[PDB]
Symmetry: D2
Subunit: 246 residues, 4 copies
């Protein structure tokens, strides 16, 4: 099993692994560490995979649950996902790459004033079945302790700020998060599988394949409610917790 | 001596006072307090004033030293404490002046923007090359009130890029110059305004079609800002006033 | 009857007039012209006025129908032409009102922003669900002057995303409410203001600490905007006024 | 010789060509058309190339002349470059990808109001030897007739706009231009060569290789002074024209 960095702040390729439910503990743990360290990892040549085997693999790393704007998944809910595992099924003849950004790297690049701002800022995330959650803008990752910015396209405003202030500040933060130095863009080939840490990233689909057929299979793993640098938790304004796969 | 509020967060008219250098301690003190409380105060019917008498008055309150919103001379580290401004020749229309309370603006900031501004430094410049890094929140040395320090001399914030600085400065200026924080004075003959430059910004208004307009200003020495953490402004370039 | 400018680009005081329904054609006409020229006009010493007499005056000028900058009822397609506003009960301080000339603001636009605004549509809404797509430049039906149409009822511009709309609207509002384009009136008992809603925005100011304040407004029917290319506003939802 | 699209709005790979000064007219022309159509093209496996052969090739397509912000090259000059040809010499073990955006695609995605704005807008581009040029924000490409946005990191302001307006509008335009649907990101392998149309693109280096050694060789081809949609030309405020390779 080898892990090779794809860039300075994000991304790694993991080789010498056949994904499935039969991986030993040492291998699952090596994978877990690579995920947490590199934020998004890629396995190539996984042509043996189907839906069931992908699910069997997913169960080893977490509890499975039941596009072209930058976002963190389902952040309108309080207990939004920890991670997802995504395999290519049918790919277009061109385009169709995917972007990830490290929101840990983004936080690390913030100068002190913007650290003080974001560590003391709350965003309303919504899906508009009405989900509204006030999340902190800095989250302390529950497995690594690393601070990560929490924002993305589900943010509708910041508490205490007016609509214009919120629009300007959100875009300032998005501009920083999605700086290319914080990002990896993956050109999918058949057999590829991506896994990302949704507590430490945003991602974005790209509509550059002229609507040619494209099919991916995603399995998403249950996460927990964010805690900020002061130990404060996200507040549910409206909506229910996300639930495991039935 | 009476002090009459002109608005909730800023401005008062002081009546029953003949400005000059012969005012007693009690009266000079009441004037000082009105100024610190109301941020800009106005005296009407001061027709006896000339440059000499204005200066004699000014000396009781301190040591004597357009159309963009600014705090005076903030490209310098020890920028002025206050100014005293008399109408001499007024246009037949227009020519009003605006002041904003930067104390009021700070008090209206929600918690996130307090945490931002209390940890933020702005570079102020006059382009003699004056460049000073001032804190964005200054603690008034006489009242203890916190005031936003920004305005048109700001060229950027330390650690932010040019676009971030442009957007943030305008966000802070939009807050500071909200009309609830401002008083606009239409000058009549004999009017004098005095403002606390440690707690305000002001702005001339170009709405008199360049008719002749003459005012006489006397400016009083101030000290170097202290921020909420006790830190002082940093001279990058230039000398003290 | 005398008309005195208050500023270069906006505002005049009309003296020598006792407002009411018994004014002759000549006087009603001079008042109409002063209004169209100066965008907002003020009458002082109108202590004889009551609701009935204000309405009788209003009927000579048209057909009778807070703290954010807006043009009245622009979420409707045929929004008002003008309003007439009388002080009834005034606070002991604060309580001034601001008007901006959107004609002046249009005239200050450089060529690129004229090309933008002359080809721009804004969605105005009241959230009865009123939604209207208005042009951002309207051609005044009586004067032919071009005026910016924007303000706080704007929710977005057709073809722009939410962030673009937020940034552009604020850019246009920053231009419109530049103090050179505005008049701020401190109300005294007996004061009446009348403004042309086709050529202005206005804004109440919350600087009187919620002391009691009562004004009486009468609003006059207007028509549907025409833009520089002859195009009319589009009702998306709601009825005509 | 084959040309394969890499994405809907930008980028193509050209195969079955050995780059050099010996290419026949038909081949040079096929290359020219591919460049103008796809805005940036890539040739792989060119391990025979050295500086001299790259130059011999460049001479077939134009007249050769004498990083991590998005820009169009040398736009502070009036007659800024038409195109560049870039080969990898020494590559880092990770990171080091390059981004291009199509400013033709960007113009095509503008809604009517922003077309009216930009077609009637002028930007001051500067290098701060003092180069200052007022360029139109829409340029009509001299070979294809296509309209392209002209902006990027050398813009210091727009004529008639104040500093804040200019900052906000430039970023609005950059945000549109650099939307991922308008972009291609190339992971360099040894032997790769990129050629881009500088009249129809912006590009950006990415600092994500932790300053490992990296060496590219660039040859840049002379361009001409922009003309806008009204037939108006760029204005030299200060500085000299760019000059051919001595
Ligand atoms: Cl491979
Ligand atoms: Cl990218
Ligand atoms: Cl005002
Ligand atoms: Cl290959
Ligand atoms: Fe997603
Ligand atoms: Fe000043
Ligand atoms: Fe109103
Ligand atoms: Fe370059």
């Amino acid at each position: 099993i080898t892990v090779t960095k794809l860039g300075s702040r994000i991304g790694a390729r993991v080789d010498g692994v056949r994904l499935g439910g039969d991986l030993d503990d040492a291998t699952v743990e090596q994978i877990r560490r690579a995920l947490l360290t590199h934020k998004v990892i890629f396995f190539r040549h996984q042509h043996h995979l189907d839906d069931s085997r992908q699910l069997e693999f997913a169960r080893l790393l977490g509890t499975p649950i039941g596009a072209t704007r930058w976002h963190t998944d389902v952040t309108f809910a309080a207990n939004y996902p920890a991670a997802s595992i995504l395999r290519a099924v049918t790919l277009p003849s061109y385009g169709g790459s995917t972007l990830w950004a490290s929101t840990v790297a983004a936080y690390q690049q913030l100068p002190e004033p913007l650290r003080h701002l974001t560590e003391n800022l709350w965003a309303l995330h919504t899906n508009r079945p009405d989900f509204r959650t006030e999340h902190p803008v800095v989250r302390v990752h529950p497995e690594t302790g690393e601070r990560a910015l929490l924002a993305g396209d589900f943010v509708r405003g910041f508490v205490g700020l007016d609509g214009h202030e919120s629009s300007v500040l959100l875009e300032l933060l998005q501009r920083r998060i999605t700086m290319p130095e914080n990002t990896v863009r993956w050109s999918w080939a058949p057999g590829d599988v991506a896994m990302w840490d949704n507590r430490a990233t945003q991602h974005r689909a790209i509509d550059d394949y002229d609507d040619q057929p494209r099919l991916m299979h995603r399995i998403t793993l249950m996460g927990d409610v964010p805690v900020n640098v002061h130990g404060e938790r996200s507040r549910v304004i409206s909506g229910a917790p996300l639930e495991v796969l039935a």
